[PDB]
Design a protein around this ligand. Structure first.
Ligand code: HEM
Length: 346
């Protein structure tokens, strides 16, 4: 097929199935979302340069936006101004640090970026959308009610790519080391290192060190460090936290982007298999059925023990993580720890 052909095929599908979102439609059309979006260029999308160092700070020009980051089973939507942005010297790491938009950006796999200005009945819905080497969405930022609409066009023109294009280059997915079996992991060393952890940020390196998958290490850590929970407990913890006003942290990401909410959750709702947070500045959409394992995890650090809940899919990938709200230098709060431990292990 061609990009003109793809665009047409998609519009035909959406006419048939207006509930279908871009990501769903792309799958039905047997292409990546990135490809689908590129089929839009010259119609209602403009391809931008992948110049993250200029683009990311510039989004701050737009005022309050909505940032959307998801994986297969969980969608995180947070509202606020896109600041404060810092991008590393080597241009491979980005941060957005603020009480609202709070992001960790791993720019290396970021491949293509488009500015979309989509006709609505009456207005136009504008978004910046980023895609990875495989065409899978990385991160999106949506203009909303309160955005500075006049920043839009100058931003697009400044970042507009020379070759507008509608094809999109994609790379074949890169090496998966085969997992070791549990019996091949040095469990004592891993536990020793676990006990020695000084900052929750060092966890990743610890896994790399012993060659263990994250779920695998939890399994081998022992009950004092990690315990499996009934999968249905996660929604219940949200419900209990809603009940008390406890400020929590909710981490949701994919291989290339992590988005964080800090604060309480208040308004919660089920719709079918979806468990939802539905607050004015924060929406969360969790497909509970996609959760294969749920762990309570405890990690030592310089600020003391940090307790979190970590939900995984069938592939061993993290859906969402919960912590208590905390500043580096402060220990976690008792109310959080009490709630996190209140639930019975399997
Ligand atoms: C700039 C200041 C930063 C602040 C204030 C911050 C704050 C936090 C806090 C409070 C937590 C949870 C509580 C704790 O574990 O101590 C956390 C966890 C985390 N942060 Fe950061 N962070 C920062 C920078 C970064 C950076 C640069 C990265 C790069 C990836 C990152 C990635 C993570 C990840 C993955 C976790 C989850 C840890 C786990 O698995 O236990 N953060 N951060």
């Amino acid at each position: 097929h061609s990009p003109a052909e793809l665009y047409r095929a998609w519009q035909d599908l959406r006419a048939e199935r207006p509930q279908l979102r871009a990501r769903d439609a792309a799958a039905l059309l047997q292409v990546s979302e990135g490809e689908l979006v590129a089929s839009r260029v010259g119609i209602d999308a403009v391809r931008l340069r992948p110049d993250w160092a200029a683009l990311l700070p510039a989004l701050g020009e737009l005022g309050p936006i909505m940032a959307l980051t998801r994986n297969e089973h969980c969608v995180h939507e947070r509202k606020g101004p896109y600041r404060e942005v810092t991008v590393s010297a080597n241009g491979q790491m980005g941060l957005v640090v603020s009480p609202d938009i709070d992001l960790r950006l791993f720019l290396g796999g970021w491949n293509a970026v488009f500015a979309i200005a989509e006709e609505t009945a009456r207005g136009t819905q504008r978004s910046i959308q980023v895609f990875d080497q495989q065409g899978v969405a990385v991160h999106k930022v949506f203009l909303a009610e309160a955005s500075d609409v006049r920043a839009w066009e100058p931003l697009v023109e400044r970042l507009r790519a020379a070759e507008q294009d509608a094809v999109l280059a994609l790379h074949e997915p890169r090496a998966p080391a085969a997992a070791l079996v549990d019996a091949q992991i040095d469990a004592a060393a891993l536990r020793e290192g676990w006990a020695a952890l000084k900052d929750t940020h060092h966890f990743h390196a610890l896994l790399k060190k012993h060659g263990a998958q994250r779920t695998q290490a939890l399994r081998l850590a022992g009950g004092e460090w990690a315990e499996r929970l009934d999968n249905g407990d996660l929604a219940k913890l949200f419900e209990a936290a809603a009940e008390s006003g406890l400020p929590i942290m909710v981490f949701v990401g994919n291989a290339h982007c992590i988005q964080i909410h800090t604060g309480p959750v208040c308004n919660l709702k089920w719709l079918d298999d979806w468990f939802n947070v539905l607050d004015p500045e924060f929406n969360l959409h969790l497909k509970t059925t996609g959760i294969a394992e749920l762990w309570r995890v405890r990690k030592p650090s310089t600020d003391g023990i940090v307790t979190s809940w970590e939900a995984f899919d069938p592939d061993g990938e993290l859906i969402v993580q919960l912590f208590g709200a905390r500043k580096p230098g402060e220990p976690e709060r008792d109310d959080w720890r009490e709630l996190a431990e209140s639930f019975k292990a399997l």
